[PDB]
Amino acid sequence: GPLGSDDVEWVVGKDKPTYDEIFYTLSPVNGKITGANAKKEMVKSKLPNTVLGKIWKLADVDKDGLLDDEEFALANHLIKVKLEGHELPADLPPHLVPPSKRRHE
């Protein structure tokens, strides 16, 4: 629901257009890239499959084996977090996960 009071700033949404540009230049399928294109990119990140794997399991918002716009954004984000010299805690805070996964309680 746009316009109200509940606004959540998705951290990865501020530097998302970069991953968007990469997203489309990886050859997407129907606007969603598969584990093939994604993994190709992720191995060109030169990171181990273990780190990449936990990235996937956290970044796969749909839990659909694919990386959508927001999923791939999260993936690339965690990759560069490692590049910045950090670790992935295997936790997904409410403002790290797209607000599209929230129920109405």
């Binding site: 994604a38 273990t50 990449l52 794997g53 996937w56």
Partner: peptide, 12 residues
């Protein structure tokens, strides 16, 4: 349940 792996990483 029986795992949750369908990712291109944990397949090897």
């Amino acid at each position: 349940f029986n795992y949750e792996s369908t990712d291109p990483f944990t397949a090897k």
